[PDB]
Each structure stands twice: as structure tokens, then as C-alpha cells.
Amino acid sequence: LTDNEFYQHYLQNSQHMMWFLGAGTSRSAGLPTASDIIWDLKHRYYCLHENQDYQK
Amino acid sequence: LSQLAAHSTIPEPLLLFKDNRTDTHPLRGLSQYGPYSACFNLPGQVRLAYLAPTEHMRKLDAIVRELQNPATPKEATNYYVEYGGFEKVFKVPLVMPQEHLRCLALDECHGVAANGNGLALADKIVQSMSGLFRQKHAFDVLLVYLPASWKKCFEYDGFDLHDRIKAKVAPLNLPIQIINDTALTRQCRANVMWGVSVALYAKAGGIPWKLADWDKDEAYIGLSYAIKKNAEGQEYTTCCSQVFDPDGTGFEFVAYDTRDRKGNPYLSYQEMQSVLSKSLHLYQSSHNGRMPRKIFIHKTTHFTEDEIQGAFDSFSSSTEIELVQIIQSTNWYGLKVDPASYPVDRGLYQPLTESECLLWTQGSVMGVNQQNPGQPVFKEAALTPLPNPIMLRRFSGNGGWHATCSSILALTKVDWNNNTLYKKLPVTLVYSQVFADVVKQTPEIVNEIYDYRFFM
Amino acid sequence: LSQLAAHSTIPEPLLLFKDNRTDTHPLRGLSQYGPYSACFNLPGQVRLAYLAPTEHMRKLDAIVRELQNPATPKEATNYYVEYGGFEKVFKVPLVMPQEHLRCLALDECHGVAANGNGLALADKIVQSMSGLFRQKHAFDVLLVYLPASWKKCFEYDGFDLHDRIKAKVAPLNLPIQIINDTALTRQCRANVMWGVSVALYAKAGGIPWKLADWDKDEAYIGLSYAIKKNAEGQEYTTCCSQVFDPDGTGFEFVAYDTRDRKGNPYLSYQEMQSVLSKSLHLYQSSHNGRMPRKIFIHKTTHFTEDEIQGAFDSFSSSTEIELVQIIQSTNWYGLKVDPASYPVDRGLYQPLTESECLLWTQGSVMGVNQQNPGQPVFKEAALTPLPNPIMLRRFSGNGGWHATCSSILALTKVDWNNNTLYKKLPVTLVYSQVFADVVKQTPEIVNEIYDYRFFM
RNA sequence: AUUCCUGUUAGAGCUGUUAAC
DNA sequence: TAACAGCTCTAACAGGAATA
Ligand SMILES: [Mg+2]
Ligand SMILES: [Mg+2]
Question: What residues does Mg(2+) 3 bind to (chains B, C) (predicted)?
Fold first, then answer.
């Protein structure tokens, strides 16, 4: 289904429409994504066991 | 009580190639993707010249000619990949030298071969190559050939022929890749061809490979020494090396003397503070002037109390100094059990005590072997059955075995002069040793710092 | 109805110099005090290198000697100041290269130039740099000379040799000061000593001068584009430059292609959000995470609705955004009356409409006249008899024409590459345009960001 | 390309306003 | 999507030097 037909399809009937936003949209809101959270966790843990400066 | 601290196996470091296509195995990555400097087109075409006695001239042509043809390995086939020639593998043409560039060793050298005078032979060879001083732009790498008949002056007490030749030629700024009968004396052609091809490409100015995802803000210093057997006492020649990565894409590798007389290999406060300040200025010059956040120092012997303070007083507070001593001779050795059919994994480091760890720089590596895919490869299986673990003694690092262990493991893979998978020591240590030999042979080098491409 | 809103002349911005002294005349202050960055030792000494054909190297050494010795201004003596000698004025020795720090271009470059192939000529010039690359630590700045015989490849359609060379040597970290026969001829031959000398100091170290009265909490952004004429259509390559004064003393000036193909110079909402994100992330990295409080986005063309929405949504509410558009060609032009002999004082801004203002980046400047002190000076007197103002069409702001106008005026004076007193456009726009030309010539540069000293 | 921007010759890019398709 | 109007920009050249 081409995007334009979907837009017409929605515009045609947007009164009755549930939305199901996943974690992808929050990606732009500036919130760290799943991968960003994973990398923050590794970095947070890696610096503590191996004593390294966090902000360096 | 038979329980030790949990060992951690550092993964095999990756090497950077053309188009930043990473690979652990250097030669295979060179075949598949090509040299690191190919994207910059830095060497362009490679132009090389000869300097040998005419009675062996043809030999040089032959090997150079055979540099331009494919070769299939017969020895160490479990590791070495099929050679494709300089034009194909390095994406760079190999230029046949013209008669103007080609030189002949002056006749009196042969005569002094009978005299057994190493200094005279080296000076005569330099004067033979003096015909190439003016035509420095025409050629990039010189191929000096020393015949087996000169073996009497090859090595003797207090003198090293290759060392003296390179010490004489380095201030003139023209690389040589000395070729002896050995290179044309072995059996596996692909091994020597990989060696000479990589050596020539790196000596021209290109970078065959670089450490993948290497931090540009860390400088890895390495200090080594050499013995000169003086008539009255002993002489210790200490020289340093740096393998930092500048803000650009290429990476640097420069050694220099630590200097008037030393009877012990331990740098005092003044000398160590001076060599580290020179290293700091060297690093600043490349990175526009930015401080190195952390500096790693690999010494073959332990750091003195004054020497540690000398290392500290040379840098600011932001710099993190991890003084490390590398020990090659240890009573420990490891056996891998699951009894593994192959030796203990390379990079497996075992923290023995506070500020003392065992690193297995030597060992089996996964996925590198070509024949029988999916099996470990032991590079030194010829020399011995086991891999001997080196030992790190920490002196200054605040914390973390991973930083030093991974840094050293990755550093043992960027020796272009080496045509095998890795080394026993980081390139800092081996190049500091090589330059220590060079300086010990020739005292009139202490003033200037030199790149790795000259002495490799 | 002929009485417009009262204007106010923003005074000449002060420039931070040696020992934090301020002087609105750049060259006079440099002679009197010295470079701002000379307070610390970022450049230890300006070591140079030469790359030219063997025939024209004498021009390079002659011009270097001319830089060494003082010179007197012959043309435009109204503004220029007598050269005091590089060592005296920049307080740093200028080191002439030795034999090995002085390379020779391949003779194949002449053949390529005769063939009229710009790409291969640039590649050959870059490949000639290997002799210096073996000694990259030795020198700081490389003076590449191009003989007039290569004019056929200097500039033609779909190509520019200067941009290609800059983009090829930018990832190799070596600054390059290209010299055309223009430093040979060039009668006011103390011009050369200041333009070339200030460029050499900036490329070896940095910050010849810094703008004073600069809030550390403002990051200034300038977007500019260029056109690559495709066979079928066109490609609009737009890139963004950023200036800011960080917590450290080193004022920062970077650029980075925001970008695949674009058909119009108006960035899409996703592209602006990504470019703006990269910008404030760079600021945060240079400000230990502190959020910028004022953001100025100067664009040569009007912001669409998408661009303004992207600006609004990329930042938080605490950081007010000053979206301003700069119009170069305008119908309006003014004449000062008390009628004055010299045109209107530089920096006068005249609010025409609630969103559109005239800014006189060109005009008479007070207090920088060498002869007959007190007389006004018009920088573009030779080019134009009257100053053509620019139009600032504010697309987003809370209040205050003075806040943006003074920032633009101060940003028009920190172009170290500019020999003259000021620039018609802020340094953000000019550097974004220069980098846009570079990226248009070499599309494979979008990965990295670069400091000003590489491309100025 | 030490610089500066003054003009010339062209084309695009946006807006529009119509006619459509 | 095809013209047409304006506003503004860059892309190639050429080009002379700070109130005389
Ligand atoms: Mg070798
Ligand atoms: Mg320049």
C-alpha cells in the first residue's frame, strides 16, 4: 500500500483510529533510545569495576 | 586455595583497512580490502632503486619481478593467505627502476670485505649510494643487497652492519629495505613476499593497516635499552618510542634517544622528566596542542622511586599516567582446559596480585586460520608447544587491568616489519629496542627524533 | 512619513590580544602587543616545508625570506601598518626548512597539467607529499607552490584545484598554505608578509586574535550552500559552521557538512534537527555539558516553516533561538550627513520593518587610521565608492536588534584568513561557504568536522 | 590560490498568479 | 506541470587597490 493512499485512507476515516506508538517515536523527543540506554549502562558499569574517570 | 582471580579473555583487536573495513587478520584484510593509506592515495605509485654489487644485480630484479607475480604459501599455510602481487593486493603499481636510478656497489667494498672492517664497509656502501643523494625525488625506497660473501662483516663484537648502515642513512632521509641471501634463501615464497611487499609499501609512506577504533587522545610511550660493552665498564643506551594517533586519519610512530653517560638502565629524575617533556611536546605538535588525557609507559625494567616522580612532574593533572613494566621471563605458564586441543587463548589476562597480572600475548586466535576454517591458529607452534605468558607490573595506574591489557594486546599487532599475526611485545617496546641498538652503534643520532619507517 | 526609526551605531568591536589587551585594529595590535594565543605555547615554533617543482623553489625561499624581514606598505597605506618582522611581531621564530624538509613535485605533474586533468594533478600533488609525511612531526605548515604553467587546471567547470587539495590533505592533518605566483608579483609586498604571516601563524598553532566581549554562553551558527551542476539536474550541497568562546581560552571555529542529494538549499525539518543536534552536542562537549543559552543561526536564504519548527523543537525552552537571515544584495544604500566626506560610519543598523533591518557591515571605521589620525577609513574605497549594506530578516527572536547586530559585527572581524580590516559577512557564513565549496568538490568529506585553520 | 568585493555574463532556487492535468 | 512576475543566490570570469 502506497503512503499517499494510506493518508487518504486515514484522512477518509481518522475519527475511529487507535494509535500504537512504540519506543521509536521517543527517539526524536531527545530521550535516549534502547541502544543509548544500553550504552549508558555499559559505560556506567565499565567505569566502576575498572576504575576510570567517568567524565574523562 | 587453588582458586585464582577470574581471568578475562581480551578479544582479538581489529585492524583498520581501506574504506575502514575492519579485520583481525592483517594479510587477509590486505587481500580483501587493501592498505589503510589506499583511500588517501598517499604512496601513489611506488618507485624503488637498487644498490648492490653488479654480480648479484639480477637477483634483485628477480625478487622485484617476483613481487609482481602471485605466490602461494607452502610453509605456515594454516595462516598465510594466497599472495596476489603488489599491483593487485596494494592497489598500487610497482615501478621498474630505470638505469639512472639503479646503482652498483663500488668495487673497493669487495676489497674491504677481506679486511674485516665493518665501519669502512658501511661508509663505502654509503658512498656507493651517494650517487642517489641528488635523485631523491625519483625513487622512494632503496633496496641495498648484502651478499653472503660479506657475512664476515655482517655481525661481530661491537658492530652491527645493518644497524650501522641504517644509522648512517637515516639522517639523509631515504629509506632502505636491506635484502640479504636469507630472503632468497628460504622455501615459502608467499611468506617473504608478504613481508617485503608490506615493508616496501610502509617505507614508501603508506599505512598498510591501523588499529581499528584507536583512541586519538591516548599516547603509548615505550622505553627500552641496549648494551655497549665498554673496555672499562658498561654502557646503557636508553631510547623511547611513541605510537600515538594524531587528529588526522593516519597514525604516528616515532622513536628518540633519552639523552651523557649511563652505567645503569634507570633514568634519573632529570633525564626521565626531559624525555617525557619531549614526548609531550611531540604529542602536542600533532594534536594542535591538546593534552594527552592518559599516557601509557612500557618499560622493560621496574620504575625507580625518583623515576615515577619524574614521570609525574612532566604532565598536568588532567593526564592519567599508567606506568607499566613488562616482564618476559616468568616461572608461570598456562594450560587451557574446558584439556583444550589448542593452547590458551591469546589475550587471556590473569590478575595475580594487586599491581601484577599475567597477560598471554602469545596464544591461539579464533577465526584467523585460512586452511581448515573455524579452527584456532598458534603462530609460534614451530618454536615451542606452549605460549609463554608475559607479566605486567603496575606502578602508577589508578585502576583497571583492561585498559593496559587491551592497549598492549592491540599494540602487538601494528608492526609492519613483522609479517606474522602478532609479536611478543607491544610495538613500542620492540621499536624502542631497535632504536636503542641503532643509537648504541652510532652515538651521533641522539639529537634528532626519527620515524618508524626509517628503522623498520 | 520620511522620518524612520532612530538608528544607533554599534562601536568597533574590541579584539583580545597578547596579555588580554584589546585593540580594534588587528594588524596594529599584532605589531604592538602580539597574538592572543601567544600567551600560551600552542605553537612552539613555526616550522615550514616547501612543495614545488624544482624550477620555482627559489620563489618559495625568497618569499619566506621576505616574511623573515620587515616590509613597508606601499598600497592602501591608509590602513596597513609597517611589518615588524615575523619574530618580532608574532614573538615566535619562523624556521626555514632544511634540505629534507623541502620536497620537489614530480615531473609527471607537468605532464598532467599539459594534459589538462585537474583531478590527476591534485592527486599527483598530494602523492608528492610522502617525503614530508615520513617527517610529519618535523614541520607544522607546508607551503605548496603552483607554477603559472598549471593555470589550465587551476579553475574550470565542475572542478577547483584548491578545494580538492584542501579536502585531500585535511584528513592528513597537515596544514597547507597554497601560494600562487601572487606572492611573487604583488607590489604592495608587505601585504604578503601580513596576509601570509597571519595565515601561517593561524595554521601553525592558532588564534592570532580573538574577539573580546564574547559571552561564553552563546553559540553562533552559519549555514551556506554551493551548487554542483549535474548533467541531469543540480546538487545543492549545504554545510554549517559554528563559532563559540568555550570555558577554556581557545576560541573555537569549526565546520561540518550537515549531510543524500538535495535539490534546494532549504534544509528539511529532519536535516535541520540533525544539524542543530550535532551543533549543540559539540557545544556541550566543549562546555562540559552546559546548555547554550543563546543560539544564532545565520542563513543566506530564508528559513522555511520546516527549518523554524526544527529549530524550535531541537532545543529546550531555556535556550532562546535567534533565527536570522542575511541578505547580501539589496536596493537600499545610505549617505551620512552631519553631507560627510566619507560614507556612513560602519556598523550602523537601521530598523526598516518589524522583522527586517539594514546593517552596514561596510562603511567608514574610526580610530584605525595610521596617517593623519582621526580621519575615517573606507575599507572598500577601491572597489566601491559607497558601502552596500546587508539586510537582516529576523525569522525568530524575542527582542533587541542590538543583540544580533553587535554579534554580527564582531563576527565580521575574526576572519584570520582575511588580510583587510573586516568582512562583509560574518565569519560563520564565509566559512560555511568555503566548506560548502570543499564538500561540493569532494563529496567524501561529510563524515568529519574540521577546525578553521585547515581551510582558511 | 596572501587578501578584499566591485561589476559582467548566465542558470537555478524559492515564493506566487493563472491555465490546466 | 507549463508559463509568467519578483527576490535572492551561486557559478565563471575580469580586475584594481582605500578622498584621489
Ligand atoms: Mg625490515
Ligand atoms: Mg590561505
Answer: 456
